[model samples]
Target chain A: SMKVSRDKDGSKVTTVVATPGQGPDRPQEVSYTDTKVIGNGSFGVVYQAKLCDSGELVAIKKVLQDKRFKNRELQIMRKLDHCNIVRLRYFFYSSGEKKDEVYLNLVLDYVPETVYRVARHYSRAKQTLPVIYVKLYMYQLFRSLAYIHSFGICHRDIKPQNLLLDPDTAVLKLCDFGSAKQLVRGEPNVSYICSRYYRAPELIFGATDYTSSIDVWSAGCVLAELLLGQPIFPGDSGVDQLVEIIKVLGTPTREQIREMNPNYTEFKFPQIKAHPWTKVFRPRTPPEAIALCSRLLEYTPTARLTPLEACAHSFFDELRDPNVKLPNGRDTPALFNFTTQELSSNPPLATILIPPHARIQ
Target chain B: SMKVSRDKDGSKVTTVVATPGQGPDRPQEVSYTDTKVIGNGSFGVVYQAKLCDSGELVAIKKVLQDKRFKNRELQIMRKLDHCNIVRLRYFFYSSGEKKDEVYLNLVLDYVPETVYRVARHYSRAKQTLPVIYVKLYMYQLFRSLAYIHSFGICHRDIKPQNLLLDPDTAVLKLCDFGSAKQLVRGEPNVSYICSRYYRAPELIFGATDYTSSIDVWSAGCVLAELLLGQPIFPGDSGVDQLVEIIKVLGTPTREQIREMNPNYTEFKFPQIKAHPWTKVFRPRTPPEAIALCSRLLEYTPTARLTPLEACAHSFFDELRDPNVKLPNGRDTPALFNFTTQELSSNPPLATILIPPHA
Candidate 1:
């Protein structure tokens, strides 16, 4: 059984124990009413549900009972209370005479949109997004990051799939804080903690004492995906991911890593005289876009962009109006209210310049 | 007179009209009694105030009667309802009979600490922060940004001055959203936003069709500032800022700009034949730090970092603890309620093995 308590200093104090059965006062004869399955991850299944009594829509994430998984979720949810993070409404546990069961009921703002859904809806050539919409979307994403980083927490997982969009208001909501962690107050180790497609280089070579800049690297991948409508580094394995990164931003020398971290040479890589630099796919991304992506996806996390630094980049100059009116002149809508979907089959590709009567070349 | 109203769609609906001073229904006059001026910006002044009625300490921001400034604050506050962002507990307008004497009162969460204060406290040490503390502080900043960007808002002004710390808990809050923008849907023209010191390169080169990555660039600058305890580029003008950037990362070539935006020739630096790559200062930073700084400080905005990507960088690997224990069992205080001072200055920089012991 797991019990939650708050300390005098206003921090969350959680106690987890391995008990035989559910504690007293556990809900009996529980019925699992599944509404909509939004997405799936390594350990749990997230579903949209409607509480029978309250008639309120909520998200239910059911994790297979594992001590590590349980503890991780508790640690993350216990420390997160910001609006940008998906709020944890409550939890449900049923310990019957026969068996003990636990379920987490998260009441969240319903966002009926995802990057995949948005891409599918407006994937056609006729529905090309105006520069304004792109800027607006990017701005919302930036602000969300600004708020998230301000709390000294880092979202290890940031992809289109993890980002929820409010259907009505188009406000972006950062969903998964499950992989979030408080950076160690001192140097520790150097390693990776994100999906391969979006993982930064320092992670690839095993630099453990990284910082929140890693999240900035993932955010850079997300921006590229938003513009290109596909995974930037759809690699099959870790080595392939490194190859893809090198193809775009050039390779990092062993000396560079050694200089960054003395323990870097302990890791092994194939023999190569010089770092290779080659062009992968020609993305329709602008020079500014390429520059930003290259820097963010650099072989080192320390070189990655920080949220505040991204705000001052030239790429936002056109789409940003410091004094622009909020959409519909009110508060931004909650992002979790939206539904999640897979990437579209034929997402629109952002070309540098489309001819008047152009066809796919 | 500017009247604030909430729209059904949660958009900021403002009614601007010419009216006489102090309408009859003006809210009760709020006094700045026993308040401390914690920070001040172009738009208004922020004071740490204690409400007499509730005895609750709050940060009060007095907004001048400029319609643009009011609208900007109103739009950002209404749209942003995040924990890391300074919360707006309440607001009201107080107008004096004099036409020029009008102000808006915004009560926000009072963060008792500032980065500057913490930096000053540790000024004597050769290297003040513990590596763990730097990672932790940077992580908090990243998480706050993730929340803000998730909502489609761009915090144009992100620096140490804009961040406040809670005295009771070592938590940092991003304050001052006056320069924040919603990125209106379908608009284009990027050159007109952001603070100069933290501005991205595309803005320096006059790129209009920019994206939210600009915020990422500024965030990088702020992180560097936090790490070094000073502004990375204290350029007095745009050209000087560009030169500072070029000195570190090297100047962008025409071929590079032409690959993205064909209008590269228009903003080309004809004086140089190649992109000059040189160290900005004699005390060279570590390759990792230098790489991160160069990436974020690019002259091209599109080349900036995204919040999520930054989190995965190896820079934070050692500092992050997936199973970090919160101070209390309550989520609110564990996450939201914390003093920034306790966290910032005491980072674990002492453990880092500087080549030569200071």
Candidate 2:
């Protein structure tokens, strides 16, 4: 899916004519210098560079644009906008190192921290991040998910590393949309998306028309990781990911199995009582946090809490406090600053979604 | 433009179904409490209230809505989205105190400090604001101006009071669009717009063809005020405003007068050489800052620096350094994080607009 060619001098200027990510697409020229590979995978190569004109930092994700039609990722990235979501500023097209080869470069905002690095900061020091931040970061993630899910777009990849953060600002922005798609009813999709550790139970059952609720299950895994400083469901493959889930959730009942995938019924395994959510994490974990995890990790896809409802959960109640502050003493980001459309999506959550300090006269 | 009646208890809840500002216009019910007047003016009334659904502060601007046409302020505000610009969370319609009286309530993010208050704090202490803050605040103001001006929206009123800032986050958001208008080339706009302190020279001359350049001029006045701790052009009237401008900018040549307003020939004023920019402010002020101010406060409207060009000026180059920081020792706000549309608006600025550290 991707090929990485070393920049011979390690400092090369790359310029291309690109289109804006949001609003009207007005094509313009964008240039950057000092490029180096920050990350690479089946999706593409991510390079960090300094823009010459503004002297600001930017991350350019270059992927091979398909010759047959418009890029799917481009179409969706242009449709999303939220404070919690990683911003796609400009996208440009350039020739790859190979002849007749073309690549699409997405210029994204550079966030200096990530949940993975942040939680590791605490774990490496034999500590845990202040619970306030956990409430802060997780609340924002749910908010971003709520905004996107409203449009039927499922972020197939929801993992800790995908959550970009700025430790100073305590802001979180979700990145890496290569696996995202707008799911339509009756339309079949590959169940093999998302990382193995965060894979939902229904996907493991080979459900072809899985809903975005899979993202909820993944977010559940991320929440648990924060509590224990380790992935709750560590697995090497799809089969293993499912087994790890069953180990905690216990064996699926006939109806539960049918709900996951009506076509898969040839399993014979030991049935165990569901492990109590209270016992899964370290004793210091918040009970409300544990309760939220159970609601998100359910076997039935339809039973998961909608993103808005998750925002209304008691676990994030501290964020609703007008006096809450970040570890840095800055006022909490506007987690409750919901737009009319965001509030309308979950009409019933208005009472719980908005807080008293944000009410109008 | 307000119509909401006061709740005698001072904590009554007012709920309205409104449309979201940034996304699809889906109208939904929003409830708030702890309503009180935080500020009010001839533009109407500004209320500070807390949302019952989420404990977040909001500024609800209630302005009289003319049912005869779409509210121009709402039209221009809906098209704006930027970090430095005040966010419009939602908008709702309500009946006023008068019969058939309707008001449009703009629910905006409530930012705590304003450049006005921050400067007052420093002035009252007999201290000039830290240069770092001056750089931080002005850079953001220029960014917001650049974003709006690109879409042809002119913020006719550009003053310290309209620039809302967060003391903790150091974020500045441009608000109060009562005097904002979208400029169309052939359409004439009203003169005598904006507050007296930051009024541009063309506005004082009754130039109806003024463009968004007026905002750039006001920004310059704001920047100068930060350094001097008082109004640079303390004019008492429209005629006096021009005299003050001329004293600093020098007498406008006939060509310059033609550019501002061809019909503004009330009298022939004696030519006065322009005052040196250095004597205009304290000697300790940075030279680059003065250079930027000079470029912005030009006599010819067309000669003023474009907002993007001003952002790229060397005066702000200090912000480009990666190791630079805020007075509180935190990393500076994301200065070079330009969206595609922002950069695309002016292609040439990109090369100089993005910093080395990103």
Candidate 3:
């Protein structure tokens, strides 16, 4: 049910009986005012609005909901409670113009900037991103992946566009879990997932039996694009995507091809050598960063490093140093806050992950 | 200086008083029959003929000799006596058509095929050269380079066209020395020496005091071309040559630029990444071959593998195996017959370079 109301300042306020996305299932009256269309796509429309009670900005994403099935994104977002992931405030079912039309609207925290626009800002000025930002941003991304992957959830679309950022705080949050799924063994999934440039090779090979490592490959592509100031594997077609990948990584070995997809083992591919890692980037790119890329961008999905292992890599070592601060000379965002659930999977990494200075009170 | 006469069979024979290119200084009558022009260039004309006494085919290269100065090629070629290098049979001065013109004629070994033509034959057939030929040809080329480099001589124009190949026996001989020079420590040599594709980055950067390592770079280019079935670094102009090298080797660092030529150290160059060695060749190429290319095609001249060191590389390990024969299943050529002079410079490599039961 919905109600039209007026606030003390005589602004329009729309109140709806909504269910909180986290904790309790009790329906309450939620009021919001000053709505504007922020963004829209084939999936749905998003609005920038202010909460009536809290006087804070929030994004409301409204997507068409089917009467028969449950919304996977709403279920996944409700369970994901991490500092590096976007938080869901409340969700409500609204009526559409059609007789049986219904729309699912999710109220979420509003972040002004995205990594894509930030990178483009530097790219437009003909400058490479400052090294500090690369470390700060990618570290949070891996942390978010580690949390999600630990729960068997894979964010199929992990491109720069989905990474929300708070500019002043230097905090990065992984948003848009619309393509995510809790992958179960023996169950087939779609091969056509993830963005084009960030899609893993196995996906291009048409493998439906993939794991969460596909997200790791997408994360690796993000790291490479940030370093290269452009998408490293831009392709025009599905075959061309693998061609661009082969151009850099060289042709996959027969064994590597078998690892990706068993049916494609006998398929012939043009032979090519992997480009040297050191020569793949600019002359002054840090060695540790390049080393991390080599470890992540592997042909065999199982060979790629785990998201937590990526966080432990020496490339992000500078962020662990107590003296290392943001380029603006402010303390970094809360990067070492690891919950018990996160540490449960890899307890030993906690020692290196949470440095001495950032430890218990 | 010249006499036209007839031999025992009434064949027209041309006799000349020529001096031996090697050994004791002695002038004797050297007679040859059936002269036919085989090749000509900006340098001079070369004729294919037969020795009157030996009946063996010989190539007589006739070039204009300056009256005031001695020919450098004759001087350099005479000192080189390795099996892999073409031998200089005899040298004689001939008068030209003009009144005061004089020409120097050099008789050399006649090898029917060149690596250039052999490679072209396979290229036209749309085939990569067999790996065994790459190993056989490059091993002999390195041996020739090691021998000449030991004498402080650089074969500046090292290329496929200058590599003489005996197709029957599969023996490769370093043929051209027209651009050869003995590099001295304090003396300045010409900066522009080697051919375009094979020119070292240092030479392209206009370094006149370069060492024999420049020849090492050229030899590396030859090895790459043989494996790739085409020139690895084909450049159109002098600047374009460095661009091609940079495309494969990446942009040279500041220190590497200093090592190549101190003057070019400060010059700005477009940054480019090096193509990977594994991707540089076809997929079926042996890993050892790719490894050797990485060692030889270094940006720093001194960093490149020495010619003798290249001979010791594992890429040629198959060639050292006594049972390894030619593609026709015939016994291999004389490969392990290293002279005392050749072994003196680097004796340790001899053990690994030569195998038993051959």
Candidate 4:
């Protein structure tokens, strides 16, 4: 009952009227010099560019405004402002080379590297990522998650590739909202969302009304991947993601299946014991880390910890330590500088998430 | 902790770049045609403007951005979406006349009139507003309040001036968000907000942590104003407004006083019997309207009906009738097409808020 739509004008049109109000040519065009291609996928192209006016380095993501139907991403991104989320500087539409084709160009703050590439650099020598890096990445991911979920936005894609990292500052920014949505309850959504390896079990069960805990599941996989230096739920050995999850989390009960998707009727699977949390990780893995992974990868969607709860779990209590620093011995980024809206969800968790000294920031 | 200072762009430069974007121009300039002043007060300057592309009439609010602080109204307006709330179409920053000065301009949907003017129009001729318009106007106001309060925003300044109206559709839209805030628990806010006539008793008591119910109180006063053809708490007597509120509704009890503002230290007043609701307005006033007013103007902040509950009250049941039309005999605008977010708050209100035909 809450959708607000008001268009009263006949043949309504949105014009950029500037007599530059008192439109003899107002020269306020934001221009950025096109730079080298940074990345491109089926979604569209990404480029490293220079804004001639502001001299800010920005990453431009160009996507053809077609398949996504109506892109609500721009409005959502414009509202997001946190230390861990990338900032969208400006956005302007451009015509494509083909007839009747148009592209939406989003100019964003250019962070140096991706968590995917950083993890790969460690993985090449068959080494697990540093435990400190894993903690740093997971902490920021949950922070961004808490902010977005507070507004009911599900960033359907949360894999490592979507996290930008500045290796020096240890700042991880969650990016790429191609599949995000303001998931309203009772409204059906697409089940075939998010990347394959990070997909939650309910998505595999074909549940269209899945909430944002799916991102919690994906973040758990990311934590596990960084610890393993490879995809934790790797595709090759599994028949399906449910098979992979069952291998680790054990077979789901009929009740668990129903909770994931009430309409899901089939219940037939060989009951397997859950692999021990300690056994799944490498030797000498932190006990607290294993505890967090189990909490997030629950079969029941609601059973998974809310992002704010995840932030307060003892696994991240080490982050609250006064002397705790990054692996290279530098202090953390602005992790505790949450806005009023961020801490509004639960007052109890705020005490744990932000240390007293860091609360004002 | 990591506050990187942003450099201020200089110059009073103005040029209409031929290409504003790709469609009409080459992605160069953006322009707006300023017409005349629609509103000018502490809130900011709102201008009635006509955009050139297809001549879209827009209400542009000019809030100054200086070397010091940013106007937060635009950020709050962006997150707001409701049938009864003004729409934020586009926002841009422009250079000001003085150096190191900038102004943030918000282009909003241009609804021609305000509830203040409309109510005054009827009052000028010494006429009570038709009962149907009262229900239609107040129903939309509460709907807008419900949507905003769900996000923890207390529209501190809720008055007839801030309620925009379309003379043709008779649709009421809540606007002027300059003083609105996403109220955080345990955080203090300025108590000196809102106009004097509609100020809640708690605000008058200087309650810095006033909740969204202040809006509820203001709305109740609006309803009472339309009924009497003037503000209910018009401060007609040369006395404090708290005395004026007590003149009609009696002195608040200690318990009621505590509920409104626990920090309030002292007060004393002669016990006055509340004026009979029936006699508060003209004898012809509908009982439903009077009942709704009493429910909203409760001394206890928490006792006041929530916006959704107010929407579902019997005062609005006539609106649920499919054949009901505006007093002017025009067709009703969209009312019951509520989004899932709006209905999710009060589960039972959904059924009553949306009628059979809607």
lDDT of 2: 0.80
Output the lDDT of residue A336, model 4.
Answer: 84
Clashing pairs in 3: A273-B279
Model 4 over residues B1-358: C-alpha lDDT tens digits? Answer: 1121222453122223322111222333434454689756433588877655556787878866644445667668877888899887766666655555566777788998898888999989888778888899999999998889888888887888889999789889998887677888887665545666787877656466678899999999998998889877754111235656776788788889898767653434445568787888898888999999999998998899998899998988888998988767798887888877776667777777888777
Worst 10 residues of 2 chain A by lDDT: A235-244
Candidate-wise lDDT, in order: 0.54, 0.80, 0.83, 0.75
Pick by lDDT: 2 or 4, better one: 2
Query: Which should have the higher TM-score, number 2 or number 4?
Result: 2
How far does residue A315 in candidate 1 sit from its true spot (Å)?
47
Q: What is the lDDT of residue A165 in candidate 2?
A: 89
* Residues B261-316, model 2: lDDT tens digits: 76653444434578888988888999999999999998789899988888899988
Sort by TM-score, best first. Answer: 3, 2, 4, 1
i-RMS for every candidate (Å) is 23.2, 34.7, 25.1, 30.3
Better-scoring candidate (TM-score), 3 or 4: 3
Write candidate 1's Cα lDDT for A37-81 as tens digits.
Answer: 877544456777654445566676655343224545555665555
**Per-candidate DockQ versus the true complex?**
0.01, 0.00, 0.01, 0.01
Number of the top-ranking candidate, with lDDT as the measure: 3
Query: TM-scores, in order shown?
Result: 0.39, 0.49, 0.50, 0.46
lDDT of 2 at A199: 72
List the candidate 3 regions with Cα displacement exceeding 4 Å.
A6-10, B1-358
Top TM-score hit:
3
| TM-score between candidate 3 and the true structure | 0.50
